[PDB]
From Swiss-Prot, chains A, B:
A motif (Selectivity filter) lies at residues 516-520. The modification Phosphotyrosine is found at residue 136. Residues 1-302, 384-398, 445-464 are cytoplasmic. The chain holds residues 66 to 679 of 765 of the full protein. Belongs to the transient receptor (TC 1.A.4) family. TrpV subfamily. TRPV6 sub-subfamily. This is Transient receptor potential cation channel subfamily V member 6. It is linked to Hyperparathyroidism, transient neonatal: An autosomal recessive disease characterized by impaired transplacental maternal-fetal transport of calcium, high serum PTH levels and signs of metabolic bone disease in the neonatal period. Skeletal anomalies include generalized osteopenia, narrow chest, short ribs with multiple healing fractures, and bowing or fractures of long bones. Affected individuals experience postnatal respiratory and feeding difficulties. The condition improves within a short time after birth once calcium is provided orally. Ca(2+) binds at residue 517.
């Protein structure tokens, strides 16, 4: 958790004590090549002693890039280079690593010439990909050399038996490490160099078709981490051009790793299922934007709006089935205490025998069957994915996959409330209408006009109104309790705005939004400490809190106005792919033209053409 | 429609199969001039075979700019250059075209030297001016040469019999093609070169007075497409200067093609009758801004505001004629069921015999005659123009040409409702007053103060309030149905805010805008599921939806604040010209001074003078 930082830093301090109380090893921290020549020549002053992190005297000579003190330890001890560190923080790191990390060294001549091992995996905990190590350099020695942009070490290291195809404990190869580097441009140049040494290809999956232990090619990994620049360079192999015609030209894109091939994941699946921001920016690039906007124009909006009309037809025969709820006059003759009760219907229990009530038995049997169809296409998607996917990817957009569960759950209650004839049946029917109709708004994303205005709401309910509601809640029960002990010494027959304490909570909340009338009788003197504390209420309620909330809502609008126009194009892809998965193969043709008729293979293709002025 | 793209791209793939299964023709795609020399020398290996798009082996040698493979096909086949392509996509395109499109070639030496035809019209469907071809290059070979900015082909091609004055199937000449190019600056230079080769002028309409099949000169076409830069260069011939005097100077403008000459269209007519945005920017240029602002200052505002005072005097004697509507006491003695009906007048039918009611017979005969005058000056403008002109140019400004039809239509109803004495006569009179008075706002454009604030409304009613009204409509009948099944088990004598379902639709809509009081009785316990769902209503109604709508309305204001100040100057020209067309010649003098007194001709003129510091 947190004390792991408190144990890591003490290792760094403990090194400086072991570098201090050690005679030859402090001479290794400096040059001291006259003294370290003499400090070695003794009876029992062995070089295998280790500091805090389990480190030899050669490493310290390397870690402070002292070449003269390095070679004397090699000349006096030939076994010393075969020696990795043995801490739990650093582990398996040899002396070849550090001279490579310092990116400019002639010691890499010497350590290679004394037959160092170029396959020492450095799987210590200071090298795993986590947001606590500030580097991610991989494990192998040539993996470090590429990672710090030093070609002259890479060409030297590959010449003496370095294996390109060596993966890591994370599973990634040399080239996956190059994608998620922060210094993006210098990786793209040297990516071309590392690809060249793959020749003869080992007659199988040559270099950049191999997945990792998490299961991605280098091309797909460029998508998810959001490296925009490397995604440009990886399309250069994948596309190949056609005829050119003045300033007009046309190309073909490979497309074999974009759309859904089978049950395997696609790239467009991986883009929308991440929490990052830079990754979703990749949609506007030239071989993917054409694929999306063609996919939603000819097979999108028809099969979305026809899903829209069915669902609007569903609730309009649920609401019509609702308001014909059966009743009867009441038979208990104005029971528990009178004049402060008014209800007079007390729900009918089982009488359907009517030539009219048969029609509701159709309409009830419409919406209950509809509640079963909702639960059969979401509950199989809960168990197939993780449990934290629906609270998981909800920020892209996911309240609507929670509401339409709760809509189906409440309709499934009101038939259990009907089959045994309970009393309080107006509770789930009330939630059914408010949660039902607000899921019409799920279809308010396949339209340009009332599109991104929906996303502006979701980014504000889980936004400034959640921010405002707390400081609304603290004041609203502050003054209400201060109102309640004023009018408690009063008869509520006239100006009984609040007689009971769970009404002054409600009668102040209505008053805070100015949707009720403000308490006045004008006929009898309502008490004095009302009229001072009501005026002091209305200043910090109507004149301050209510319309500060429009000021910060106006300010928070334009500072996300460019982000929401990306959120919409992100949401429209996620509607397309989710619509793609459920529709069968008898509908929904695959996008783009095919092979097997043109001498291209089994892979599909897409073309596009444009003007490239000069 | 859309599958025409699905048939176009398959032609491009089918070419790559025909380039593949053809031995000499693939050798034409590369150079292969050693092999193609031998591939021709056979018995039956003729060169007239055609690929997918009906194309010969010379074209493929041209389309991949292979000069060596081009000349061997000419040397072995002299007839081969006389050969256009025969697809439906490309049609009539010869081998001279492609070497010209590639803009740098020595094959245009050779194809001309073997007597190619420089008048092969390429009227295939991949060359028509439509928003699906990314080019518009015209049809003729020198038309292509100018279009890609290569003078050295133009001077070569004009020297061997090229005809400048050759129009196209669209009707446009060489020079109309130069105006609507996208690379604007390079057209303006070479426009001067193409004008030079018109000499001897063919003693009639020399080069840039000829219209097209759509009917425009090059000067007027520069207006409508909105090419600002070419409009500067075309005024250089048209104006001619006068005396210069230090930093002060004065010029004259030609003006013979700006104002309305006769029944023919003017340029100012063509500017306001387009849907584009760049074209309406041309108004601020120096020979047109002076013409407008002088035209509206001395013959504008008088004949606009006098139209304003007549119309305000019209409705103020319609409203005065309205509220003296005749009545009587009622004679049916409180019919169909009592206490839930209140009306007590039941309109008088034909009695006008009164010394006072004669005055209304004047006032009724004022406004009915006024309704006839409205219909006699718009219905002749429907049939003379297209039917989709009033829904057509309405975005510039046109609701007011629809309302004042509907005003006249409703007043014409209420006399038919009077001549046969129907009952429900308050319906068209009510629409007459609300639609009548809102057409006073048509005159709110000839004033600086309450000017562009009108256009801010039209860009918002057909804007964010149309955006807001849908998500207002979905919630407003959501909660209302949820309110209706709560108070259905209640006697509406006390807190009968809504008893019937087409009142809870209305009583919630009033409540959503907080213009009613909020339901409270404080005396009898109104039910529990009200008070929870009312508070959850008011948060996403008064605190969220209502005042988000002011936040996005504040944000959408300043991002069109510069556009509306162009819309106003656009609207004021359209008021001037529409006022110009209807007023006779006995009024409204033509703008600017005349000829025939100064040795200038029959054309009119305008002058202006300014300072040109250094
Ligand atoms: O008695 C009750 C108690 C709670 C409620 C809850 N309603 C239901 C609808 N939304 C909820 C659920 C959906 C979610 C939401 C609403 C509107 C628009 C969006 C979005 F995402 F489209 F912006 C999301 C938040 C509150 C407002 C309150 C009604 N009635
Ligand atoms: O019972 C009804 C039913 C419909 C109506 C329609 N009115 C009529 C007037 N405008 C309409 C028509 C004009 C148009 C408009 C109004 C004001 C200002 C402008 C503009 F263009 F100047 F901004 C345009 C839109 C709604 C509001 C509603 C009234 N009464
Ligand atoms: Ca009130």
């Amino acid at each position: 958790r947190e004390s792991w930082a408190q144990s890591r830093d003490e290792q760094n301090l403990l090194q400086q004590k072991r570098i201090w109380e050690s005679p030859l090893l402090l001479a290794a921290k400096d040059n001291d090549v006259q003294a370290l020549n003499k400090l070695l020549k003794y009876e029992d002053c062995k070089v295998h002693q280790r500091g805090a992190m389990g480190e030899t005297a050669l490493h310290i000579a390397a870690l402070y890039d002292n070449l003269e003190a390095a070679m004397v330890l090699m000349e006096a001890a030939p076994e010393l280079v075969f020696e990795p560190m043995t801490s739990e923080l650093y582990e398996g790191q040899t002396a070849l690593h550090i001279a490579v990390v310092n990116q400019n060294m002639n010691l890499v001549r010497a350590l290679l010439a004394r037959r160092a091992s170029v396959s020492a995996r450095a799987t210590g905990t200071a090298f795993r990909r986590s947001p606590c190590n500030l580097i991610y350099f991989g494990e192998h020695p040539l993996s470090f050399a590429a990672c710090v942009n030093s070609e002259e070490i890479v060409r030297l290291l590959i010449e003496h038996g370095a294996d390109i195809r060596a993966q890591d404990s994370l599973g990634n190869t040399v080239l996956h490490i190059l994608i998620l580097q922060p210094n993006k441009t210098f990786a793209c140049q040297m990516y071309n160099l590392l690809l060249s040494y793959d020749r003869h290809g080992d007659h199988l999956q040559p270099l950049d078709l191999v997945p990792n232990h998490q299961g991605l090619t280098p091309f797909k990994l460029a998508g998810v981490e959001g490296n925009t620049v490397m995604f440009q360079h990886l399309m250069q192999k994948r596309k190949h051009t056609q005829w050119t015609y003045g300033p007009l030209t046309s190309t073909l894109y490979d497309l074999t790793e974009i759309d859904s091939s089978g049950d395997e994941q696609s790239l467009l699946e991986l883009i929308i299922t991440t929490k990052k921001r830079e990754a979703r920016q990749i949609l506007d690039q030239t071989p993917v934007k054409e694929l999306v906007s063609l996919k939603w124009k000819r097979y999108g909006r028809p099969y979305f709006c026809m899903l829209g009309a069915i669902y609007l037809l569903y609730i309009i025969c649920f609401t019509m089935c609702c308001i014909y709820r059966p009743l009867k006059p009441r038979t208990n003759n104005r029971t528990s205490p009178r004049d402060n009760t008014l209800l007079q219907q007390k729900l009918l229990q089982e009488a359907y025998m009517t030539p009219k009530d048969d029609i509701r038995l159709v309409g009830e049997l419409v919406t209950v069957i509809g509640a079963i169809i909702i639960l059969l296409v979401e509950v199989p998607d809960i168990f197939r994915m993780g449990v934290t996917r629906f609270f998981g990817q909800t920020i892209l957009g996911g309240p609507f996959h929670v509401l339409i569960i709760t809509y189906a759950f409440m309709v499934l209650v009101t038939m259990v409330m009907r089959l045994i004839s309970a009393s309080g049946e107006v509770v789930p029917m009330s939630f059914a209408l408010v949660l039902g109709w607000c899921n019409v708004m799920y279809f308010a994303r396949g339209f340009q006009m009332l599109g991104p205005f929906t996303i502006m709401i979701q980014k504000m309910i889980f936004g400034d109104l959640m921010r405002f509601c707390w400081l609304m809640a603290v004041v609203i029960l502050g003054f209400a309790s201060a109102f309640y002990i004023i009018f408690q010494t009063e008869d509520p027959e006239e100006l009984g705005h609040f007689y009971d304490y769970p009404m002054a909570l409600f009668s102040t909340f209505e008053l805070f939004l100015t949707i009720i009338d403000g308490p006045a009788n004008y006929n009898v003197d309502l008490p004095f400490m009302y009229s001072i504390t009501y005026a002091a209420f209305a200043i910090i309620a109507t004149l301050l809190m209510l319309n500060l909330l429009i000021a910060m809502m106006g300010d928070t609008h334009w500072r996300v106005a460019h982000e929401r126009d990306e959120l919409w194009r992100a949401q429209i892809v996620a509607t397309t792919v989710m619509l793609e998965r459920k529709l069968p193969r008898c509908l929904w043709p695959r996008s783009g033209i095919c092979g097997r008729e043109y001498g291209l293979g089994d892979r599909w293709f897409l073309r596009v053409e444009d003007r490239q002025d000069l």
